[PDB]
Structures are given as structure tokens and as C-alpha cells.
């Protein structure tokens, strides 16, 4: 569904059946509600304690086929190009893609083949570092995250003698807004994310009703507005 | 009851007991007038009750219902609010209205008067078409005639448009004004008119008639407003 039918079937769930109609919302306020149930829809369904079935990512058809058209891959770009203070001694400092929102898979191209990334938690790290080897199994790396300014720098610690190549990230991209019209105004340009112009859902279609609803609960639980409501449904933002 | 009934009895009533048969044929279209509008109105009588609320109130109009067409005004190139609106005139003896349908190609349609209130929101809508067994209606620019607008769903054609309505009453008149007046109408009719209306309101005719009388004679501005507050 396209953005003029986000906006008018937002309209007909929203005031237009309502026995005592509320006063309909301007299209700023539409895109801004839709934006946030996109993103709490994904953050909803990524996580299987997020929703209902306890399914996650890749749980079920159905939630393969919700992140399918939000599934990228990219490159980590090495970052000798200034400076910089790393944890460990021997870890290669990379840039993750700008337009990055949850990583589910990393690998690394070496001159010994490829080998998985296993993102190793702090206490894990000092676990494995207490050890007297301190390097990965066989056919796996390690990678903790590292100084980041404007986007997330990555450490990453493979075997002794060993360069890498590539290092590719399979991620899921950042959402792009939903803008139902040209934001442009004289007044002044509202943005939603740093766009005023119209911005289609570059999701499946198979989410855009659940988008939907989950905004127009948004927008009921603003109209009610006491602090219950917000604090109910705020809990679904996670 | 004839209007020489009409005449004498206004003498019984009016002259205790036992004015101008022209004086008196004006009060006796006025009251008839004022008559039709309190039955009408459900709030303008002492019971409550308007045009079928009652077995007495649909034998009050029976005579007045007439069932007639709209004809399309294609003549006049006129101005529409409305950009799928056919302009239709009513006919021209029409008080009332009090149902209306459009026989469309997809089927007859029950047209619903809508307010102007109702259209500016109807049509702040996505859709902005009736339900699916109605048309809306809204008058527009007249001349000497009632013109509608029918705005009937798109991708449809109004074949027909049926008024069912309450004729305007002909005037009672008690004699040949011509004769002893001038030149004096009542409604643009000289000569003796008859009622038009069934006999049961005959006499509430008569009673008003009668009531309005007094009080003008009686000259007291009280009265005049009081009796005038009955006028619709």
C-alpha cells in the first residue's frame, strides 16, 4: 500500500466510523506516528520476547519474509585512516555501514578462509583473555566494539599470522520513514528524520496493516493522553 | 364544506352568534396556511404529533400529497457547487417535500437532504460518494423555481427523479372578489375558490380563521403577537 492509502485508511480506523469523531490528524502527525509503530514494529518482531508468539527473526515463514525486504549486506571499511587507541594489542579497527540498525551476521575473508565473527560479551572477553591462549576456535573470529563516533567502529581479533581481506556484515538496514506528503512548508520544513519529502514503506507488504494498526493505537492512546495509556503502551517501544 | 358554508359560519362564530367576504377569504387562506405549517410541525401543535403521527394528521395532508418529476434544467448552463451535480427543477406548486428517490442505472436511490454542515464533513472524507442505496441533494441557484442539485454517485446516471410532496393549497375565496373589489387577488385568483383539503380540518380551519379575526380587531399589540406566534 502506498502512502495516500496509509493516510486514508489511518483516517477511516481512526475518526471516521468513531461514533463521536475526534478531530482528524494532520499529516505530520500521521507520518510521525507511523514512523514509530514502523520502527516499534521491527524492534517488536526482531526480538521473540517482543511479541506474542515469542518468535523472532527467523522463528517462522512469516518472520523471514517481515525483515526480507530490510536485509542487507555490506563491508566494514578498515579504519587506518587516522589514529586511534584500540583495546587489544592485536585487534584491526572497521566501520560499519552508516545505515545500520541490528547486525544478525558477520564473516571474514582471511588468507586461512573465511571464518564467523562471534560478537564476545565483557565478561566473556575477560573470561577468554584469562586463558592461555586468548584466540578464537578454529574456524571463527572475535570482534567486540570499539571508540565510535557517528557510526560503530569494530575491533576485530582473529589467529596470530593471519590478514584480512574483507569483512562483510549482513544487517538489517534502518527503516526509512514513512511521509504521507511533501513536508516542504513556508512556516517552515518539518522532517521526520531528516526528510521532508514523501517517503514510501520500503518493507514487505505483508507488515503495512500491522504498521497500521499499531499506529492508530498510537494515535488513541496520544488522544486519551493520561499517564497510564503512555506508560502501557510505551512498554511495546522496548 | 362549501364556501358559502364557510361564509355563514364565520357570522356564527365571528359575529356572536350571528366583515368583508374579501376580509374574510384573506383570514380564511391565511388560516388554512398557518394551519398546514402547525400540523406539519410535530412542535407547532398541542400534540406533538407532524405530518404520520397519527391516523388524523395522514387524513390532514391526503389531499395535499401529489407525487410528481423533477425536469433536468439543461436549458440554463448554470453554475454547480458540486462537480457530478445534475441540476433538476421541482415543480413549481411545491410546499413541502417529503420523499424523494433517483431511478439510476444501477437502481433506485432514496435521496437524503443534506445539510451543509453534513456535506463539508461527508466530503473531507477519502471516498466522498453516498451509501450505496442513497443520493444527496442540495439546492442551488433559483429562479422563480426550486432547482436541486442531485449528486449521485460517479460512474452513475440519474434516468429519473420522483417528488413526493405537499401541493401548495389553493386559496379560499367566498364570492367573486371582481365583482364588489377592484382588483383585489388573494393568490392571483379573483373568483371563487374552493378548499382543496379534506373536511376533517375544515372546521380547525375555521376556528383559526375565526381566532385571527378577533384578535385584529381587537387592534391590542398583545394579542397580534401572541396569535402571530401560531403563524409557523
Known sequence: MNVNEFSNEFDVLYNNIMS???PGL???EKSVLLTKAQEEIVKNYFEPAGNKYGKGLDDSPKRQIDFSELI?????????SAPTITFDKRAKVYDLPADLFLVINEAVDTNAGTKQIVPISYSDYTR???????????????RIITTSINNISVELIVN?????????????????????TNLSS????????????????????????????????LAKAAYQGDLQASVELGQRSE
Open 20 to 22: 463521536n469523531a475526534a
Open 26 to 28: 494532520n499529516e505530520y
Open 72 to 80: 542487507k549486506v555490506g563491508e566494514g571499511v578498515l579504519n587506518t
Open 128 to 142: 577468554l583473555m584469562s586463558r592461555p591462549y586468548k584466540e578464537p576456535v578454529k574456524y571463527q573470529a572475535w
Open 160 to 180: 596470530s599470522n593471519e590478514t584480512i581481506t574483507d569483512y562483510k556484515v549482513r544487517y538489517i538496514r534502518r527503516p526509512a520513514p514513512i511521509i504521507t
Open 186 to 217: 513556508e512556516y517552515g520544513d518539518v522532517t521526520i528524520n531528516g526528510v521532508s519529502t514523501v517517503s514510501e514503506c520500503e518493507l514487505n507488504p505483508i507488515i503495512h496493516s500491522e504498521i497500521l494498526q499499531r499506529a492508530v493505537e
